[PDB]
């Protein structure tokens, strides 16, 4: 079947896939072993937040290709004819009757 179609799936998948694979690891890593509660203050926030934590990465377009073409020149059935005059009358007759 079409191979272009196969690529189309591959590209879309690939761009998303690299982000997702990376993302699960991605956090900021480090395996810190917890200073525990020895008073101090805990927790953090940011100003606003970018939604709740669920995967959204999004894509796609079209089957592609564009075309333009020209059309002109059609349709004639037309005549044109000629003729000319003539003359001819041969001999080969002897008119006597015996």
């Amino acid at each position: 079947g079409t191979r272009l179609a196969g690529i189309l799936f591959l590209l879309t998948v690939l761009t998303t896939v690299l982000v997702s694979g990376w993302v699960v690891l991605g956090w900021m890593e480090d395996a810190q072993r917890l200073p525990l509660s020895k008073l101090v203050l805990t927790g953090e926030r940011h100003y606003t937040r970018n939604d709740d934590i669920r995967q959204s990465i999004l894509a796609l377009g079209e089957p592609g290709t564009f075309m333009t073409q020209d059309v002109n020149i059609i349709q004639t059935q037309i005549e044109q004819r000629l003729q000319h005059a003539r003359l001819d009358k041969p001999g080969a007759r002897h008119p006597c009757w015996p």
Partner: protein, 435 residues
């Protein structure tokens, strides 16, 4: 555009229903917690700006098991919808529900392809929704007519998406691609970042508001210039017209023959650039050892483990992928040969084979218009003006997506306002086959 041709009787009283009942489509995604409410059209946490921090990678929009990003779940549902519309029409006269039935067949295949794509939409929510109630996202309470959790978590997330999906394959009577993508544009734009439009820090360029708004208007502009073909045949010059008379005198002038011609090169993807730059810098750095991304905040450049090496490799590949692939098995140009027997007399007829090694090398060497389209719209948030560590100084997937509907408005109206098509000059020519 939005159209109606919905199943059951009438189609002009389905138009009446359509606008009113679009309120109902918005309502059930937003509210009613029985088939879920989260993550399809409804944000559960107010306002906008990054929620993952402490990485260069997190500037792009990052993540941390699944990701902090605005709604439109997974990646699987919408992407496969247009692909299997294309795939079944071209490859399969057998085990397909159309053989291509015209405009009627465009809407027909979309219905069936929705079922074929529903299975794909399942898959991601299996992983997401077992992790989800142990972190943000948990609704307010789901009553649950079920008594399970195994299918129950999966179902709630999918259904919200499904409502939007159904209507989206209904509008596809006039059946072109870049349809799916528009529905998908809306969700990401609506949530992502105008609260401060470009984060300020009292620096060279980040010091004023509404900077981002200016940038978007050029990005559409490129896509609308894109549809222009490339043209130029042998073509000669126009010298003659002719009149109707019963004796003739002169006919023929301009004639256009297609070997195929450039159909545009960069076509199809709509978020492509942003992810390419991102991956090989990251994987070397800190899924390995090393460091290197975008850094600094000045016009000292940086931007050195990404940008133009992203282009060469990927760019070249994708554009040739268009030309080459299809050419081997099932291609526009097949179309040209049929449609131009009526061409005959002057530009050539039977020869050896029409075109040869000429068309081959042509599409190959080219590559330049593939560079132009791909680089110009994406370079804009990649460099911007500096190298700052606030958003839009590498990555720009947000501004790639939006452009698609914007283009539509002038193009689509011209086709709509008449029962259009073109051509009429033949009836199938009589065959003289010899030699």
């Amino acid at each position: 555009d939005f159209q109606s041709a919905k199943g059951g009787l009438g189609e002009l009283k389905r138009r009446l229903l359509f606008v009113i009942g679009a309120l109902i489509v918005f309502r059930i995604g937003s509210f009613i917690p029985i088939p879920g409410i989260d993550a399809a059209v409804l944000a559960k946490l107010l306002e906008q700006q990054r929620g993952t921090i402490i990485e260069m990678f997190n500037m792009f929009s990052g993540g941390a098991l699944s990701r902090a990003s605005i709604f439109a779940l997974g990646i699987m549902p919408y992407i496969s919808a247009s692909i299997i519309i294309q795939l079944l029409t071209v490859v399969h006269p057998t085990l397909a529900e159309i053989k291509k039935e015209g405009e009627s067949g465009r809407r027909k295949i979309s219905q069936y392809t929705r079922y074929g794509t529903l299975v794909l939409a399942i898959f991601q929510s299996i992983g997401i929704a077992t992790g989800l109630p142990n972190m943000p996202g948990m609704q307010g309470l789901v009553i649950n007519p079920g008594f399970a959790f195994y299918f129950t978590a999966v179902v709630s997330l999918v259904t919200g998406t499904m409502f939007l999906m159904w209507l989206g394959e209904q509008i596809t009577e006039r059946g072109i691609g870049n349809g799916i993508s528009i529905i998908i544009f809306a969700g990401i734009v609506a949530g992502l970042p105008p609260a401060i439009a470009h984060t300020i820090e009292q620096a060279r360029q980040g010091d004023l508001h509404f900077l981002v708004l200016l940038l978007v208007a050029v990005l559409v502009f490129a896509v609308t210039f894109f549809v222009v073909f490339v043209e130029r045949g042998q073509r000669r010059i126009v010298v003659n017209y002719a009149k109707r008379q019963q004796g003739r005198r002169v006919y023929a002038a301009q004639s256009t023959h297609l070997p195929l011609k450039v159909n545009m090169a960069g076509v199809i993807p709509a978020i492509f650039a942003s992810s390419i730059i991102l991956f090989p810098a990251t994987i070397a750095s800190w899924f390995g050892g090393g460091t290197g991304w975008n850094w600094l905040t000045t016009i000292s450049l940086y931007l050195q483990p990404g940008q133009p090496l992203y282009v060469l490799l990927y760019a070249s590949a994708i554009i040739f992928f268009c030309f080459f692939y299809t050419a081997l098995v099932f291609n526009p140009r097949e179309t040209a040969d049929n449609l131009k027997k009526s061409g005959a007399f002057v530009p050539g007829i039977r020869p050896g084979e029409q075109t040869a090694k000429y068309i081959d090398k042509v599409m190959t060497r080219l590559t330049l218009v593939g560079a132009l389209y791909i680089t110009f719209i994406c370079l804009i948030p990649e460099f911007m003006r500096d190298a700052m560590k606030v958003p839009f100084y590498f990555g720009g997937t947000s501004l790639l997506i939006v452009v698609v509907v914007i283009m539509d408005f002038m193009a689509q109206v011209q086709t709509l306002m008449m029962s259009s098509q073109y051509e009429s000059a033949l009836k199938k020519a009589n065959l003289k086959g010899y030699g």
